[PDB]
Design an enzyme around this catalytic site. Structure first.
Site, PDB file in Angstrom:
ATOM      1  CB  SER A  45      -0.913  -0.021   1.251  1.00 42.53           C
ATOM      2  OG  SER A  45      -1.926  -1.053   1.147  1.00 42.53           O
ATOM      3  CE  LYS A  48      -4.005   1.655  -1.436  1.00 42.53           C
ATOM      4  NZ  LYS A  48      -4.439   0.775  -0.354  1.00 42.53           N
ATOM      5  CB  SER A 105      -4.848   1.631   3.296  1.00 45.32           C
ATOM      6  OG  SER A 105      -3.779   1.140   2.455  1.00 45.32           O
ATOM      7  CD  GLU A 141      -4.094  -2.168  -3.205  1.00 48.19           C
ATOM      8  OE1 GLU A 141      -4.109  -3.365  -2.906  1.00 48.19           O
ATOM      9  OE2 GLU A 141      -3.298  -1.360  -2.670  1.00 48.19           O
ATOM     10  CE  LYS A 209      -1.402   3.817   2.610  1.00 49.81           C
ATOM     11  NZ  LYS A 209      -1.443   2.781   3.703  1.00 49.81           N
ATOM     12  CB  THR A 210       2.043   1.361   7.133  1.00 47.70           C
ATOM     13  OG1 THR A 210       0.618   1.393   7.333  1.00 47.70           O
ATOM     14  CG2 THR A 210       2.707   2.251   8.168  1.00 47.70           C
ATOM     15  N   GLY A 211       2.262  -0.372   4.650  1.00 44.80           N
ATOM     16  CA  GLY A 211       1.703  -1.455   3.855  1.00 44.80           C
ATOM     17  C   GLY A 211       2.037  -2.794   4.491  1.00 44.80           C
ATOM     18  CB  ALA A 212       0.629  -5.528   5.610  1.00 42.89           C
TER      19      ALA A 212
END
Ligand SMILES: OC[C@H]1O[C@H](O[C@H]2[C@H](O)[C@@H](O)[C@H](OCCCCCCC3CCCCC3)O[C@@H]2CO)[C@H](O)[C@@H](O)[C@@H]1O
Ligand SMILES: *C(=O)C1=CN=C(C(=O)O)CS[C@H]1c1cn2c(n1)COCC2
Length: 265
Positions: A45, A48, A105, A141, A209-212
């Site tokens: 993510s 983005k 997100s 996505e 901004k984070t993601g997994a």
């Protein structure tokens, strides 16, 4: 805490995964810490932020408006659409979609924005035009989070992501108002911002901004600094670890602690 490099190594040993990291001065681009900085990691993510950079470039060029309302249908929605599912009837502005994508997100919002910039190929072409020759988006996505071993699709490197973020935020590729907007969306992250502030010492700035993803993939793109200033870009990606989400979060936090304790390098 150990020195940052030592703490990154310890986090690999503990996770039995690969960590990639850069610490960069926002104003100058000075690289203070590199670790696996030219290795590939799934963006998840974190893409983005770059997406809405591409949207803002179109706004500056007169090719887009943040006010323009996009209408969409329920069949268009993908998994995790917390904001966009509420606006089937009334639509969302392009700027609202970027807020939803970055601060929540929201995955449908991200896909609606991708359609405005030419899809994954369009976003990749934008990256090449601002001189990022490495980062690539190939899927929509939510398929872009798959993190298959050995697969170069939907990847960046820590060094390329950091340089790209600095270009978007500071290089006057984006107009002044657009740079301020991009920054503000990262300041307003609801997924991890408040949690990070809860463990940061008083006086430290965060925007992020984070993601997994699968197989332990995890990441953060962040602005951090003392004295309430966005002094450094910090990019950390993790891949190929069986660890719990909580342990991945704790290892990234421990890298953060090392940077704070050893800030003047
Ligand atoms: O002397 C420096 C500081 O040391 C401690 O602060 C601790 C804090 O109590 C702890 O909660 C945090 O954990 C780390 C929190 C960082 C969260 C991750 C953030 C990262 C992730 C990568 C992108 C940038 C942000 O460590 C710092 C440094 O030891 C003291 O509590 C504080 O009073 C003192 O000002
Ligand atoms: C972004 O990193 C991201 C990752 N992963 C998945 C997934 O694991 O299924 C889906 S898309 C997207 C996402 C989904 N959520 C967030 N980000 C934020 O937390 C809520 C759910």
């Amino acid at each position: 805490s150990p020195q940052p490099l030592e703490q990154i190594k310890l986090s690999e040993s503990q996770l039995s995964g690969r960590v990639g990291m850069i610490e960069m001065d926002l104003a100058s681009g000075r690289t203070l810490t590199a670790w696996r900085a030219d290795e590939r990691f799934p963006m998840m993510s974190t893409f983005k932020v770059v997406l809405c950079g591409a949207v803002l470039a179109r706004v500056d060029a007169g090719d887009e408006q943040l006010e323009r309302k996009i209408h969409y249908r329920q069949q268009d929605l993908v998994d995790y659409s917390p904001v966009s599912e509420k606006h089937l009837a009334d639509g969302m502005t392009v700027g609202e979609l970027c807020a939803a994508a970055i601060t929540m997100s929201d995955n449908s919002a991200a896909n609606l924005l991708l359609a405005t910039v030419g899809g994954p190929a369009g976003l990749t072409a934008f990256l090449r035009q601002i001189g990022d020759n490495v980062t690539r988006l190939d899927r929509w996505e939510t398929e872009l989070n798959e993190a298959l071993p050995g697969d170069a699709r939907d990847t960046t490197t820590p060094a390329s992501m950091a340089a790209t973020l600095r270009k978007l935020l500071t290089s006057q590729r984006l107009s002044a108002r657009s740079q301020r907007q991009l920054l503000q969306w990262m300041v307003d992250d609801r997924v991890a911002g408040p949690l990070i502030r809860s463990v940061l010492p008083a006086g430290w700035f965060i925007a992020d901004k984070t993601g997994a993803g699968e197989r332990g993939a995890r990441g953060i793109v962040a602005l951090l600094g003392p004295n309430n200033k966005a002094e450094r870009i910090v990019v950390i990606y993790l891949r190929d670890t069986p660890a719990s989400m909580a342990e991945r979060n704790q290892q990234i936090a421990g890298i953060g602690a090392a940077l704070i304790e050893h800030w003047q390098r």
